[PDB]
Amino acid sequence: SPVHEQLQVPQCLAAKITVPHKILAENKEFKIIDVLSSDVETLTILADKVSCGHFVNVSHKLTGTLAANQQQSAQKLLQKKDVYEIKHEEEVNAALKEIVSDNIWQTLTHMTSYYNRSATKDTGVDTANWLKSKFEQMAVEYGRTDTSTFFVKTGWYKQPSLVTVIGKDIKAPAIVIGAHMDTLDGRMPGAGDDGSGSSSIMEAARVILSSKTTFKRPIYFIWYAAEERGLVGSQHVVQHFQEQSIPVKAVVQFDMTGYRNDANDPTMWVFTDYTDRDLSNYLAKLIDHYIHVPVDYSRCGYGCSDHASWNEEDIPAAFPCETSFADHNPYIHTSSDKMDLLNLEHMTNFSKLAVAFAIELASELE
Template sequence: MPTLTLTRLSAALGGMLLSAAAAHATPVWITLGDTALKQLQRIDTSATAQYSTTIDAGKAADGAVRRETVHVVEIDDSRLGELAHAVHHARGHGPGYIVHDSFDDARQALQPVPAAVAKRAALTAYTVSNAPQINTWLQQLQASNIVGTITSLSGFTNRYYTTSHGVAASDWLALQWKQLAGSRADIAVEQFAHTGFPQKSVILTIRGSDPAAGTIVLGGHLDSTVGRTTENTRSPGADDDASGIASLTEALRVLLANDYRPKRTIKFVGYAAEEAGLLGSKAIAKQFRAQNANVVGVLQLDMTNYKGDPKDIYLITDYTNAAQNTYLTNLAKTYLPELSIGTSQCGYACSDHASWNAQGYPASFPFEADQNDSPTIHTVNDTLENSDRQANHALKFGKLALAYAVDLGGDASTAVKH
């Protein structure tokens, strides 16, 4: 038997590992914009668009309609983490793509929302109600509680959607929200199981007194990544997006501590697998659309604890609802006049609000910065120490979320327009 030299043995083993990796790689279809496509082609020079079209990306700050070219591409799923990491560093947001079940599914996702769906979404009256309890409740939010939630979530080895730690993080969040809900019969906490990966989304529902008034959804993603993430890769994800979950959880705590009972049904959601192509939110939003659910507003909190630019909150204007964005600005002026509000853009599929927007639901995305968001995103250095250690920036988003939930949710003394 001939003897292998060390070099030849190394080459042989390397080839075996590459073959094994290739054998486990699964082709998937994704939709992505121009910026993400350029990043993908740097990673995989063979990547080509199988279908391209120009879609409505919302309105710019001056009211002009924005359009963006979006592409359908087939790639190996083993490259998705690397792509999300590249997009995040190229434009400050991610993942920048949406994963689909097939070419037909991907192509269908780029078709315009049916006119009847768009018309229904335009019926919501976004009028600030000046609910008297909001100002009182806003004073009850505490940054220290946000620090506690960020610390707990970032303490998991990672929260990646395929790992045992990602599963445990979902279980932990479900338990926290169940404890906040206590014994209230009008509140339910469930874990939404997904096909193809073990991490579950978490959904807390406060059942409204008037089912015909519709539903409000407030969400953030519970997973984390550093690009190529495996079982024991360290990925704290303190800002991305433990901060968003923490801001929402503190708003939820105050609502329930005051025994808030809305007219509209309100759902708080911790989405699974955002970093892998909006998988969790896509499945949930598609289910809501299939059930013809009347969702009157969606608020996404993804990265809330790094103040990299002069203004306090930046409303993303692409792939969001202009009327609801104006409403959020007016909410801040009414209840949080100390905050300065700006606008920014983040491109195609930059967070979970895009899943709801694609289904024709009005969605908004208040973000932590404009051009200078946290530089440690998707690294082992995305820790509380490298954002706002006291979570005072994240507190602003928690307050906005509470004002949004109560003002739009209504109560027994507040008329809700259908």
């Protein structure tokens, strides 16, 4: 009766695991382990202190067709030219002026008022419904007629991922902007992680929705479910896109957009592992050109956030973040991850970055 899940874990982290678990398979860099669903969260907290990477939930990949067991499936898992330019300055600059910082603060206020937004809880489902209806309200408010919304289910997890699209009938490789809506169990305001990213892209979506521009690509805004369970929701979303043959040009992930290590240092960080090099380089250019704050670089290890799900399928993916890995918000995944830690100018800048990304890339066709 108790649910088991299977996780892919870097060796540096797996060596320090004390909760009960079976090892299904192992190579130089990874173990794949079997744990109780109820123990997964302690692993997240351990991963935070070990700081050598997180994990990926591979439960769904082990039930894949043309396979016998789990241990044999686990062993097979562990075995063995796009140009980006800045060409829409006038349009991007006008759009950036439309961003309303108070909207981000108010969205964030609502999200943190749930006890938590865990993928196994009804409040996790409420969050998804609330985001969906907010998107739909805004589309009506600004008379944008080419939008659509739908849920992507998350297996036995209650909370679905939310997929929204602007330009639903445009047949061209899509631009994707993402964040995750969930938190851990217990009291988890999840303001920094990832209420801030969720709120930043919601306001970016508002600005695109108020636009009268016809783009050359569809633009997706996605709030993934169950990121904290090991990227479960983004894995289902990527699978949905593959099954439905929806081509994707470029993906950006917003996971934590509000914490400044130094309140007067507005530096934005570009993460360089499990991301596309050219697209990451493009993000730095966007920040420099449109946001006019410094750029620095960091790495955050395996299973870091939902961009990794896209990157694993060789889809160009990038990840800007509020801090370096070394200086990250220390109250992450605790009840102290609150709005009072955060900087609204920082969050607004990430929201501006989402809009520039969307406009620049969706306005061009290869």
